[PDB]
Amino acid sequence: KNPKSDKFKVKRFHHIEFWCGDATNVARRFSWGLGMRFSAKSDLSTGNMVHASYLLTSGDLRFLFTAPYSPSLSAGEIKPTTTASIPSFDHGSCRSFFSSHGLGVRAVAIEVEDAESAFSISVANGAIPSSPPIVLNEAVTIAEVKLYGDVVLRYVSYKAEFLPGFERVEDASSFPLDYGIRRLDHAVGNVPELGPALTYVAGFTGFHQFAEESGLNSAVLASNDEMVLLPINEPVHGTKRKSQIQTYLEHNEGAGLQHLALMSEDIFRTLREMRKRSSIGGFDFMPSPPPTYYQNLKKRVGDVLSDDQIKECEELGILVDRDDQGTLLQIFTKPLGDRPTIFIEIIQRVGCMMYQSGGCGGFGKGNFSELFKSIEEYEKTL
Amino acid sequence: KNPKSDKFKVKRFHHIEFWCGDATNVARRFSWGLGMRFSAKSDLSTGNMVHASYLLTSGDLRFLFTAPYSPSLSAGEIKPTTTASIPSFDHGSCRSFFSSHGLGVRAVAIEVEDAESAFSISVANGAIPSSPPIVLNEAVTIAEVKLYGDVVLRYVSYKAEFLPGFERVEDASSFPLDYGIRRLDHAVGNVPELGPALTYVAGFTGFHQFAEESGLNSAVLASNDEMVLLPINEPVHGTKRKSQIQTYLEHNEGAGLQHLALMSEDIFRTLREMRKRSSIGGFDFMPSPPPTYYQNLKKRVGDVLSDDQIKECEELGILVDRDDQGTLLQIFTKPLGDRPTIFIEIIQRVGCMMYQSGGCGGFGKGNFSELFKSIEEYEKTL
Ligand SMILES: Cc1cc(C)nc(-n2c(=O)c3c(C)c([C@H](O)C4[C@H](O)CCC[C@H]4O)ccc3n(C)c2=O)n1
Ligand SMILES: Cc1cc(C)nc(-n2c(=O)c3c(C)c([C@H](O)C4[C@H](O)CCC[C@H]4O)ccc3n(C)c2=O)n1
Ligand SMILES: [Co+2]
Ligand SMILES: [Co+2]
């Protein structure tokens, strides 16, 4: 069931903004590790005395990395005279976020039909305002409401190239890296209590519940065409192994974004390229499932994947799940930074052709049982 | 003249510590960009609840990257019960340093015969104490005094593997990168007033002055065998072009470390490898001198470098200077992070064979005039 109850017209995920201590070093690391090109900038060289912001892109995926300069460079400015290209930016909010949470996602940005109306309707329906609608160069409108913790849901709408005040990046600095990642599939929050978090967010968006012992409860909120997908997790206490959601909350100092799932047009090539770079500046992946997991794939998805394609999943540590509608290939990175908090998921979906409907195959919930069983079978085998 | 007036026995540069917002991302970026291997760690996986510290090495060059965790993880600790592996670390000092200065060098560490005696003699001779001598596992002693700004001169001495509490890094995480960098040649501070800075540092070390219109005055302090080299710069005001030292002080919020000069055993190979990676996660270099500069090298160092070796300098943007004792090959990176503050110099020295004496060829002061003249000649040519 999809009641299509969005209270305002939502299009697609637009970008993700990380708040950083040094945007240059995080952006260069992510660019090499994920195969994302340097696409735009707003910094001292573009007249921005307030913050350094660098945009990486791969297909439709947009990762923004932002850090504050010394407040002294902009001390004579006021908001009417600001040189910041992102008017919601605040030195104090950014420093406090990073000191509290470490490196992580400040903004989950979605493109909407009209950011001013989305902001008003959201707030009229319970959203806590964070930054009011601001029109940039009579061209782009941006507004922000609280999502969970210190993460904001950012609305952006365009009259008709990222944002005014950003400059497109010089070719020599723009190496055309590409490992096959094409768009953001979903963005996942960890919270202490799932119920109130869902009620808040579904309350002000109209997003509906998407139909779907290991330490979490989770549910997924979705827009009308189910292309904006926002899962939310809560911990389950008193288990044998401590909940990874609770470990997140402790190290993150509370709720925040847990993982970003990036859709690849070729998850085999993406993982080959990412794994080649894991130990030379890139990202590391979680430990691979045992061979028993891959023997069990024949019975589960042997009608979807060939023996060679299953063996390729085994070589790359790829996990596989399946819905009543489709099939899911997924893998998780180790944490992106110092703290055991945010990580990345790489994903590719098979099925649900109509274009492919959003969330085809689910989110991998079936792999909690399949991993456990396969680990037990492997332990008993040896 | 070398009076050999060190007040305590100094050996060599030991390491450089960067204070970071996220140590993981800076260390991975530096590793790929400079060809430095992941050598040791002290973090949550080693029992450190206080800070994440990662060590990169190339030859004798040691770069340490350190960031604080949430204070809540260590809130029940006291200094007698600390899990920090670096006892001078303080969450508040680190957060304040980074918020004030951005990414940069907190500690210039030198290996001494006895860190407790070096600390006592330094303080008895005017050094401002920063962290008292602390003996780690009855094996290593560490102590810190202020150098300039918020940069400390760290003393380390060994009874007889980086520091106790650090673990050597697993092979799979340790990719054996190497672009030829072998040791730290010198470390340079920017200060508002050179005179008092020199008098302070030379006062408590006994380091002597090393014998050597463009916006700076500078002088170099050196240990007895002149293998520890600490240049210090001050701005010169009222010039045509604004002093780069003054721009540093403004963006850094005061004095701090300006550049680290890394000696390569093969500066041609180092620059080839670094430039291949500039736009895929590595470091960018300053704009190359005009061809007139390289035509002028024949008259200056044609007895030192062949035509092919001069043409190789031209291909790589390498600068060349010469002493009465030796010849200097050098090049500078763009700033390492968001702010136009710290950068890196790659260097290789020819001559002064006895081993090679420290500082052979000077520090490139002759290239201020040579660059200007060659730019004027190139402008007139076109
Ligand atoms: C090393 C380690 C330690 C622990 C405690 N769990 C794991 N782990 C996962 O984190 C994991 C995740 C994050 C997902 C989804 O992506 C999420 C969806 O987007 C939203 C719905 C629920 C979310 O879980 C799916 C399966 C997972 N499976 C099987 C798993 O085993 N891995
Ligand atoms: C783009 C740009 C803009 C400006 C204002 N200056 C430059 N520049 C330099 O920064 C530069 C530096 C940093 C050095 C040494 O390494 C230092 C020694 O270690 C200590 C003694 C003095 C120190 O200068 C040598 C020559 C330099 N030359 C010729 C130059 O032109 N480059
Ligand atoms: Co997921
Ligand atoms: Co130098």
We report the CATH number of the domain holding residue B121 as 3.10.180.10
- Tell me the HSE value of A211 on the side-chain side, using a 13 A CA sphere: 6
Is there a domain that residue A1 lies in? no
Give the residue, by CA position, lying nearest to ligand 1 atom 8: A368
Whether residues A243 and A323 fall in one domain: yes
- Residue B313, by phi and psi: left (phi above 0), alpha (psi -120 to 50) or beta? alpha
Whether residues A194 and A139 fall in one domain: no
B345 is in an annotated binding site: yes
Whether residues B245 and B113 fall in one domain: no
**CA–CA separation, B239 vs B221, rounded Å?**
26
Q: What are phi and psi of A101, to 5 degrees?
A: -110, -15
Tell me which of B173, B195, B221 is where a domain ends: B173
Which amino acid is located at B301 in the chain?
Answer: V
Can you read off the two tokens belonging to residue B362?
Answer: 């000077």
B259 is in an annotated binding site: yes
- Chain centroid to Cα A106, Å, comes to 11
Q: What are phi and psi of A333, to 5 degrees?
A: -80, 160
Give the residue, by CA position, lying nearest to ligand 2 atom 1: B286
- Chain centroid to Cα A194, Å, comes to 19
Contact B328, B362 (CB under 8 A): yes
Closest to A231 in 3D by CA, of A254, A264, A204, A257: A257
Closest to A28 in 3D by CA, of A170, A165, A174, A171: A174
**CA–CA separation, B376 vs B39, rounded Å?**
46
Residue for token pair 């329906």: A125
**CA–CA separation, B308 vs B315, rounded Å?**
10
- Contact between chains at A103 and B25 (C-beta distance less than 8 A): yes
Is there a domain that residue A258 lies in? yes
Q: How many angstroms separate the alpha carbon of residue A344 from the centre of ligand 1?
A: 11
Angle in degrees, 0-180, between the axes of helices A23-34 and B23-34, rounded to the nearest 10: 70
Furthest CA-CA distance within chain A: 70
Set of chain B residues whose Cβ sits within 8 Å of the Cβ of A340? 44
Which member of B28, B29, B338 has the closest CB to residue A69? B338
Angle CA B181–B182–B188, to nearest 5: 85
- Contact between chains at A28 and B282 (C-beta distance less than 8 A): yes
Whether residues A143 and A214 fall in one domain: no
- B326-332 and A208-209: which strand pairing? unpaired
**Resolution of this structure in Å:** 1.9
**CA–CA separation, B214 vs B223, rounded Å?**
28
Is there a domain that residue A2 lies in? no
End-to-end CA distance of chain B: 45
Set of chain A residues whose Cβ sits within 8 Å of the Cβ of B89? none
Can you read off the two tokens belonging to residue B89?
Answer: 């670390």
Whether residues B110 and B226 fall in one domain: no
Whether residues B73 and B213 fall in one domain: no
Handedness of CA A268, A269, A274, A276 (dihedral sign): positive
Give bridge partners of residue A155 from the DSSP assignment: A110, A143
Q: How many angstroms separate the alpha carbon of residue A42 from the centre of ligand 2?
A: 27
Mutate to test the pocket of ligand 1, among A188, A262, A300 (most ligand atoms within 8 A of CB): A188
Closest to A321 in 3D by CA, of A352, A366, A287: A366
The reply to whether ligand 1 has any atom less than 6 angstroms from the CB of A288 is no
CA of A245, nearest ligand number: 1
The torsion of the CA quartet A158, A159, A162, A165, rounded to 10 degrees, works out to -120
- Contact between chains at B73 and A23 (C-beta distance less than 8 A): no
Set of chain B residues whose Cβ sits within 8 Å of the Cβ of A246? none
Contact B221, B208 (CB under 8 A): yes
Whether residues A205 and A316 fall in one domain: yes
Q: What are phi and psi of A46, to 5 degrees?
A: -105, 10
CB burial class (10 A; 0-12, 13-18, 19+) of residue B355?
A: exposed
Which member of A28, A100, A337 has the closest CB to residue B281? A28
Radius of gyration of chain A (CA): 21
**CA–CA separation, B177 vs B172, rounded Å?**
13
Set of chain A residues whose Cβ sits within 8 Å of the Cβ of B280? 31-32, 175, 177
**CA–CA separation, B336 vs B101, rounded Å?**
13
Whether residues B168 and B185 fall in one domain: no
The torsion of the CA quartet B337, B278, A260, A361, rounded to 10 degrees, works out to 180
Name the structure determination technique. X-ray
Is there a domain that residue A129 lies in? yes
Which member of A24, A69, A103 has the closest CB to residue B22? A103
Can you read off the two tokens belonging to residue A29?
Answer: 């690391």
End-to-end CA distance of chain A: 45
- Contact between chains at A253 and B25 (C-beta distance less than 8 A): no
- Contact between chains at A72 and B44 (C-beta distance less than 8 A): no
Contact A111, A11 (CB under 8 A): yes
Is there a domain that residue B3 lies in? no
**CA–CA separation, A262 vs A184, rounded Å?**
5
Residues around ligand 4, an ion, CB closer than 5 A: B 261, 345, 363
Contact A145, A203 (CB under 8 A): no
Contact B312, B306 (CB under 8 A): no
Residue for token pair 């990168």: B177
CA dist list (Å): B370 to A110, A362, B36, B296, B300: 54, 65, 32, 9, 10
Whether residues B162 and B188 fall in one domain: no
CA dist list (Å): A373 to A22, A64, A292, A376, B330: 43, 39, 9, 5, 59
**CA–CA separation, B67 vs A102, rounded Å?**
9
Is there a domain that residue A4 lies in? no
The reply to whether ligand 1 has any atom less than 6 angstroms from the CB of A186 is yes
B14 is in an annotated binding site: no
**CA–CA separation, A325 vs A211, rounded Å?**
11
Tell me which of A173, A192, A219 is where a domain ends: A173
Nearest-atom index, ligand 1, CA of A368: 29
Q: How many CB atoms lie within 10 A of CB A355?
A: 8
Set of chain A residues whose Cβ sits within 8 Å of the Cβ of B43? 338
- Tell me the HSE value of A343 on the side-chain side, using a 13 A CA sphere: 16
- Tell me the HSE value of A167 on the side-chain side, using a 13 A CA sphere: 13
A283: nearest CA partner in chain B: B28
Set of chain B residues whose Cβ sits within 8 Å of the Cβ of A73? 250-251
Can you read off the two tokens belonging to residue B65?
Answer: 């990257």
CB burial class (10 A; 0-12, 13-18, 19+) of residue A238?
A: exposed
Which amino acid is located at B34 in the chain?
Answer: L
Give bridge partners of residue A61 from the DSSP assignment: A58
- Tell me the HSE value of A104 on the side-chain side, using a 13 A CA sphere: 33
**CA–CA separation, B130 vs B144, rounded Å?**
5
- Contact between chains at A28 and B102 (C-beta distance less than 8 A): no
- Residue B245, by phi and psi: left (phi above 0), alpha (psi -120 to 50) or beta? alpha
Listed in sequence order, the residues at least 6 apart from A101 whose beta carbon sits closer than 8 Å to its beta carbon are A149, A150, A252, A253, A256, A339, A341
Nearest-atom index, ligand 2, CA of B258: 13
Q: What are phi and psi of B22, to 5 degrees?
A: -130, 110
Contact B378, B352 (CB under 8 A): no
Is there a domain that residue B283 lies in? yes
Furthest CA-CA distance within chain B: 70
- Residue B335, by phi and psi: left (phi above 0), alpha (psi -120 to 50) or beta? beta
The torsion of the CA quartet A165, A9, A261, A172, rounded to 10 degrees, works out to -20
**CA–CA separation, B70 vs B64, rounded Å?**
20
**CA–CA separation, A140 vs B208, rounded Å?**
60
- Residues whose beta carbon lies within 6 Å of some atom of ligand 2: B 186, 188, 215, 218, 231, 233, 244, 259, 261, 286, 332, 345, 363-365, 367-368, 371
**CA–CA separation, B48 vs B163, rounded Å?**
13
A281: nearest CA partner in chain B: B28
Q: How many CB atoms lie within 10 A of CB B230?
A: 25
Which member of B24, B29, B32 has the closest CB to residue A337? B24
Closest to B103 in 3D by CA, of A308, A158, A28, A352: A28
Nearest-atom index, ligand 1, CA of A188: 19
Nearest-atom index, ligand 1, CA of A286: 1
Nearest-atom index, ligand 2, CA of B368: 29
Listed in sequence order, the residues at least 6 apart from B247 whose beta carbon sits closer than 8 Å to its beta carbon are B340
Q: How many CB atoms lie within 10 A of CB B360?
A: 18
Whether residues B198 and B151 fall in one domain: no
Whether residues A21 and A120 fall in one domain: yes
- Residue A29, by phi and psi: left (phi above 0), alpha (psi -120 to 50) or beta? alpha
Closest to A32 in 3D by CA, of B25, B287, B271, B285: B25
CA dist list (Å): A286 to A274, A317, A344, B86, B174: 13, 8, 10, 29, 17
- A/B interface, count of CB pairs below 8 Å: 126
Mutate to test the pocket of ligand 1, among A220, A363, A370 (most ligand atoms within 8 A of CB): A363
Radius of gyration of chain B (CA): 21
Give bridge partners of residue A145 from the DSSP assignment: A129, A153
Can you read off the two tokens belonging to residue A355?
Answer: 């274009």
A170: nearest CA partner in chain B: B279
Q: Which domain holds residue B119?
A: 10-173
Listed in sequence order, the residues at least 6 apart from A306 whose beta carbon sits closer than 8 Å to its beta carbon are none
Q: Please state the three-class secondary structure of chain B as a single string.
A: CCCCCCCCCEEEEEEEEEECCCHHHHHHHHHHHHCCEEEEEECHHHCCCCEEEEEEEECCEEEEEEEECCHHHHCCCCHHHCCCCCCCCCHHHHHHHHHHHCCEEEEEEEEECCHHHHHHHHHHCCCCEEEEEEEECCCEEEEEEEEECCEEEEEEEECCCCCCCCEECCHHHCCCCCCCEEEEEEEEEECCCHHHHHHHHHHHHCCEECCCCCCEEEEEEECCCCCCEEEEEEECCCCCCCCHHHHHHHHHCCCEEEEEEEEECCHHHHHHHHHHCCCCCCCCECCCCCHHHHHCHHHHHCCCCCHHHHHHHHHHCCEEEECCCEEEEEEEECCCCCCCCCEEEEEEEEECECCECCCCCCCCCHHHHHHHHHHHHHHHHC
**CA–CA separation, B188 vs B201, rounded Å?**
13
Angle in degrees, 0-180, between the axes of helices A267-276 and A307-316, rounded to the nearest 10: 30
Which member of A23, A175, A280 has the closest CB to residue B177? A280
Residue for token pair 């990176």: B333
The tally of domains found in chain A comes to 2
Contact B156, B118 (CB under 8 A): no
Closest to A130 in 3D by CA, of A159, A107, A98: A107
Give bridge partners of residue A144 from the DSSP assignment: A131, A154
Residues in chain A, overall count: 382
Nearest-atom index, ligand 1, CA of A215: 5
Can you read off the two tokens belonging to residue A381?
Answer: 């085998």
B247: nearest CA partner in chain A: A73
Can you read off the two tokens belonging to residue A269?
Answer: 């090539």
Q: How many angstroms separate the alpha carbon of residue A242 from the centre of ligand 1?
A: 14
CA of B293, nearest ligand number: 2
Contact A209, A231 (CB under 8 A): no
Is there a domain that residue B5 lies in? no
A31: nearest CA partner in chain B: B281
CB burial class (10 A; 0-12, 13-18, 19+) of residue A59?
A: middle
**CA–CA separation, B367 vs B374, rounded Å?**
10
Q: How many CB atoms lie within 10 A of CB A82?
A: 15
Whether residues A232 and A195 fall in one domain: yes
CB burial class (10 A; 0-12, 13-18, 19+) of residue B271?
A: buried
Q: Please state the three-class secondary structure of chain A as a single string.
A: CCCCCCCCCEEEEEEEEEECCCHHHHHHHHHHHHCCEEEEEECHHHCCCCEEEEEEEECCEEEEEEEECCHHHHCCCCHHHCCCCCCCCCHHHHHHHHHHHCCEEEEEEEEECCHHHHHHHHHHCCCCEEEEEEEECCCEEEEEEEEECCEEEEEEEECCCCCCCCEECCHHHCCCCCCCEEEEEEEEEECCCHHHHHHHHHHHHCCEECCCCCCEEEEEEECCCCCCEEEEEEECCCCCCCCHHHHHHHHHCCCEEEEEEEEECCHHHHHHHHHHCCCCCCCCECCCCCHHHHHCHHHHHCCCCCHHHHHHHHHHCCEEEECCCEEEEEEEECCCCCCCCCEEEEEEEEECECCECCCCCCCCCHHHHHHHHHHHHHHHHC
Q: How many angstroms separate the alpha carbon of residue A278 from the centre of ligand 1?
A: 21
Residue for token pair 């291997």: B37
The reply to whether ligand 1 has any atom less than 6 angstroms from the CB of A48 is no
Closest to A184 in 3D by CA, of A15, A372, A1: A15
Tell me which of A107, A141, A173 is where a domain ends: A173
Contact A256, A189 (CB under 8 A): yes
- A181-190 and A129-136: which strand pairing? unpaired
